[PDB]
Amino acid sequence: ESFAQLFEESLKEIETRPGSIVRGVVVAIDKDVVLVDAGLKSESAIPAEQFKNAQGELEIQVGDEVDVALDAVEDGFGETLLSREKAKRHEAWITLEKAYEDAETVTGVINGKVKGGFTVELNGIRAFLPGSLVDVRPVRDTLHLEGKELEFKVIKLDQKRNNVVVSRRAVIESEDPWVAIAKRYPEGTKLTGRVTNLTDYGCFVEIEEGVEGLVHVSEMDWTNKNIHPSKVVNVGDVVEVMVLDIDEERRRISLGLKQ
Amino acid sequence: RKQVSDGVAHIHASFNNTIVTITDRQGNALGWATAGGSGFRGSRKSTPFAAQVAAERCADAVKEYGIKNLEVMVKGPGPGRESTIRALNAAGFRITNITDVTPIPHNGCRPPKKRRV
Amino acid sequence: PVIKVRENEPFDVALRRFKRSCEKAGVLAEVRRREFYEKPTTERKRAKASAVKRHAKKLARENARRTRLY
Amino acid sequence: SLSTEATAKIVSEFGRDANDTGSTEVQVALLTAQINHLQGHFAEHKKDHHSRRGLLRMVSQRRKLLDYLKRKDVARYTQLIERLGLRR
Amino acid sequence: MRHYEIVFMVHPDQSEQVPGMIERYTAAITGAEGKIHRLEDWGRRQLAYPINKLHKAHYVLMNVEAPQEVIDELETTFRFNDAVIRSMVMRTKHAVTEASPMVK
Amino acid sequence: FCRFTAEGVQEIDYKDIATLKNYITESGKIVPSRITGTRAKYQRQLARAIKRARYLSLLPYTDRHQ
RNA sequence: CUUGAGUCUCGUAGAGGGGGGUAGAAUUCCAGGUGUAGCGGUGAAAUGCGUAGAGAUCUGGAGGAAUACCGGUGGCGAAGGCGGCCCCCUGGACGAAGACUGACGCUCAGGUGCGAAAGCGUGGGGAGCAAACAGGAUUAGAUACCCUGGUAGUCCACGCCGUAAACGAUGUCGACUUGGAGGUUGUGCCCUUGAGGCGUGGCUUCCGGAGCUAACGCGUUAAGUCGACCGCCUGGGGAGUAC
- The set of residues, in sequence order, having a beta carbon less than 8 Å from that of E53 and lying 6+ positions away, is none
Chain breaks in chain C (C to N over 2.5 A) after: none
Question: Looking at strand G, which nucleotides approach a protein CB closer than 7 A?
Answer: 6-10, 12-19, 21-27, 33-45, 55-60, 64-74, 77-80, 84-92, 99-105, 113-115, 127-130, 145-147, 158-159, 183-186, 194-196, 205-206
Q: Decide if B73 contacts C2 (C-beta within 8 A).
A: no
Residue E36 falls inside a structural domain: yes
> Partners of E38 in the beta sheet?
E63
Q: Where are the domains of chain C?
A: 1-56
Nearest to E23 by CA among E31, F55, B107, A2: E31
E64 burial level (CB within 10 Å; 0-12, 13-18, 19+): buried
DSSP assigned state of B81: T
CA A56 to CA A48: how far, in whole Å? Answer: 10
DSSP assigned state of A156: E
Helix, strand and coil percent figures for chain C, each rounded to 5 = 70, 0, 30
CA A120 to CA A107: how far, in whole Å? Answer: 9
Is D61 (CB) below 7 Å from strand G? yes
Question: A119-158 burial string, b = 16+ CB within 10 Å, else e?
Answer: bbbbeeeebbbbebbbbbeeeebeebeeeeebbbbbbebe
Q: What is the largest CA-CA distance in chain E?
A: 39
CA F53 to CA F59: how far, in whole Å? Answer: 5
CA A229 to CA F8: how far, in whole Å? Answer: 41
Between CA C40 and C1' G132 the distance (Å) reads 25
Counted residue by residue, chain E has a size of 104
- Ramachandran region of residue D85, left (φ > 0), alpha (ψ -120 to 50) or beta? left
Neighbours of chain C (3+ CB pairs under 8 A): A, B, F
B37-46 long-range contacts, CB within 8 A, separation 24+: B45/B16, B45/B17, B45/B18, B46/B15, B46/B16, B46/B17, B46/B78, B46/B79
Q: Is E9 helix (H, G, I), strand (E, B) or coil?
A: strand
CA F51 to CA F59: how far, in whole Å? Answer: 8
Range(s) of the domain holding residue E28: 1-92
Inspect the structure and tell me whether chains E and B have 3 or more CB pairs less than 8 Å apart: no
| Count of pairs with CB atoms under 8 A, one residue in B, one in C | 56
CA F9 to CA A111: how far, in whole Å? Answer: 47
CA A67 to CA A207: how far, in whole Å? Answer: 23
Resolution (A): 3.1
Helix, strand and coil percent figures for chain F, each rounded to 5 = 50, 5, 50
For E18-78, give the DSSP string.
HHHHHHHHHHHHHHTT-EEEEEEEEEEEEEEEEETTEEEEEEEEEEEEE-HHHHHHHHHHH
CA-based end-to-end distance of chain B: 51
Residue A108 CB coordination number (10 Å): 28
Q: How many CA atoms lie within 13 A of A52 on its CB side?
A: 11
Residue E103 falls inside a structural domain: no
CA A217 to CA A256: how far, in whole Å? Answer: 9
Domain count, chain F: 1
Please give the backbone phi and psi of residue E41, each rounded to the nearest 5 degrees, phi first: -70, 105
Please give the backbone phi and psi of residue A125, each rounded to the nearest 5 degrees, phi first: -80, 155
Dihedral angle over CA of C32, C33, C34, C36, nearest 10: 90
Domain count, chain B: 1
**F4, A175: Cβ pair inside 8 Å?**
yes
Nearest CA in chain C to B101: C1
Residues 11-50 of chain F within 7 A of strand G, judged by CB, are 25, 28-34, 39-41, 43-48
DSSP assigned state of C24: H
Nearest to C66 among A76, A252, A254 (CB): A76
- The set of residues, in sequence order, having a beta carbon less than 8 Å from that of B87 and lying 6+ positions away, is B51, B52, B53, B55, B56, B59
Between CA B116 and C1' G133 the distance (Å) reads 21
CA-based end-to-end distance of chain D: 25
Judged by a CB distance cut-off of 8 A, whether residue C10 touches chain B is no
Residue E30 falls inside a structural domain: yes
Helix, strand and coil percent figures for chain B, each rounded to 5 = 20, 30, 50
Q: Is F32 helix (H, G, I), strand (E, B) or coil?
A: coil
Q: Decide if E87 contacts E4 (C-beta within 8 A).
A: no
CA E69 to CA E75: how far, in whole Å? Answer: 10
Pairing of strands A46-47, A164-166: unpaired
For D17-85, give the DSSP string.
SSS----HHHHHHHHHHHHHHHHHHHHH-TT-HHHHHHHHHHHHHHHHHHHHHHHH-HHHHHHHHHHHT
CA B80 to CA A197: how far, in whole Å? Answer: 38
Please give the backbone phi and psi of residue E37, each rounded to the nearest 5 degrees, phi first: -80, -40
Residue E101 falls inside a structural domain: no
Domain count, chain E: 1
Q: Decide if C15 contacts C3 (C-beta within 8 A).
A: no
Q: Decide if F61 contacts F25 (C-beta within 8 A).
A: no
Q: Where are the alpha helices (DSSP H) in A19-161?
A: 83-101
Residue E84 falls inside a structural domain: yes
CA A110 to CA A166: how far, in whole Å? Answer: 8
Inspect the structure and tell me whether chains E and C have 3 or more CB pairs less than 8 Å apart: no
Is B76 (CB) below 7 Å from strand G? no
Residue E97 falls inside a structural domain: no
CA A38 to CA A19: how far, in whole Å? Answer: 10
Range(s) of the domain holding residue F6: 1-65
CA F60 to CA E48: how far, in whole Å? Answer: 5
CA F45 to CA F60: how far, in whole Å? Answer: 18
Distance of CA C64 to CAs A137, C56, C59, C67, Å? Answer: 59, 11, 9, 6
CA A192 to CA A188: how far, in whole Å? Answer: 13
**C31, B97: Cβ pair inside 8 Å?**
no
DSSP assigned state of A189: -
Nearest to F14 by CA among E101, A40, A139: E101
For A100-118, give the DSSP string.
HHT---S------BTTSSB
Question: E6-31 burial string, b = 16+ CB within 10 Å, else e?
Answer: bbbbbbbebbeebeebbeebeebbee
> Partners of A127 in the beta sheet?
A120
Between CA F39 and C1' G14 the distance (Å) reads 16
Q: Decide if A170 contacts A161 (C-beta within 8 A).
A: no
Amino acid in the structure at residue D67: D
Q: How far is CA B59 from the centre of its chain?
A: 11
Pairing of strands B69-75, B94-100: parallel
